[PDB]
Design a protein around this ligand. Structure first.
Ligand SMILES: CCCNc1ccc(C(=O)c2c(-c3ccc(O)cc3)sc3cc(O)ccc23)cc1
Ligand SMILES: CCCNc1ccc(C(=O)c2c(-c3ccc(O)cc3)sc3cc(O)ccc23)cc1
Lengths: 154, 154
């Protein structure tokens, strides 16, 4: 059983590596790293609800929109964390690139991200990314609220 | 070497568990889980810069303000992730409690969190927590910007 867990972890790590280094036109095929019913998404948004895409083929359809809205996106400063679960990885990284959201001025977006990858049968069953939406607001020219600090010492 | 790494991971895990379960008056002594020069803080804020405190004694001083602003805070749904680094852990959890920020109405704050814990010689050298600040804005009655989605399909 330990041999099976070790083998799963090693293979899954290669998939995480491949995902994190998928750039440019290869983004059109990144969905093939998911199970048929795999889910990917952004878990931190202005609404408090995730923007999640469910199903490998729907993830592939979304990559068209991803490549339009973030045409040169790269992940950088990538640190991959294996865990005691051979099917669960975390990644700390940054990401950056142009942001071209319809109805907003073209901007430059940079942020810090955490990703969660859960695997089933050697492919990604659930990917989730987490960031501070305030930095995306800034990239879109959206005013960020400020918490008044007068009575809040650090 | 492997035995030493195994020993470090097992002890460090106990410190993470203790930190995550610390609530109530025990919060006044949570800083004793840190190295003398240890750092803790919130990495996701409206400004884009962390609110971090460096030094065990300064962390202890801050606990007074933590108990004022978050008088009944509890971490729930705790999942601890060991990693390939015996001195690095991640935690996925939620947190909840009253929020009592000076000059804002008293509110009820709930959020999802990720924590990072890095250890040195059996104590926490760096703790960092990550959340979506939009949920904290809501708890304070602060208006959250909304990204227009008319052109952005999911
Ligand atoms: C592959 C799974 C989906 N992955 C993502 C990745 C990034 C985003 C994203 O940046 C955001 C939106 C979006 C929706 C649909 C679309 O076509 C493109 C962008 S709306 C919105 C509001 C905010 O407050 C913050 C971020 C976003 C959304 C989903
Ligand atoms: C030593 C560990 C530091 N740990 C924390 C934990 C939580 C916060 C926090 O919620 C925030 C503030 C705060 C500052 C000083 C203080 O006394 C109490 C609260 S201001 C602010 C603005 C935002 O946009 C979002 C969050 C916060 C800050 C620091």
């Amino acid at each position: 059983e330990n041999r099976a867990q070790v083998a799963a972890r090693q293979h899954n790590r290669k998939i995480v590596e491949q995902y994190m280094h998928t750039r440019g036109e290869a983004r059109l095929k990144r969905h093939l790293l998911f199970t048929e019913d795999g889910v990917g998404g952004l878990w931190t948004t202005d609404s408090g609800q995730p923007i999640a895409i469910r199903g490998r083929e729907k993830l592939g359809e979304h990559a068209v929109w991803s490549l339009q809205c973030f045409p040169d996106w790269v992940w950088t400063d990538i640190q991959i964390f294996e865990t005691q679960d051979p099917n669960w990885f975390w990644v700390e990284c940054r990401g950056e690139g142009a942001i071209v959201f319809p109805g907003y001025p073209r901007g430059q977006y940079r942020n810090h991200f955490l990703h969660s990858f859960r695997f089933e049968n050697g492919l990604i069953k659930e990917q989730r990314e987490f960031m501070n939406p305030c930095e995306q607001f800034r990239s879109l020219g959206i005013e960020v609220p400020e918490v008044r600090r007068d009575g809040l010492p650090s």
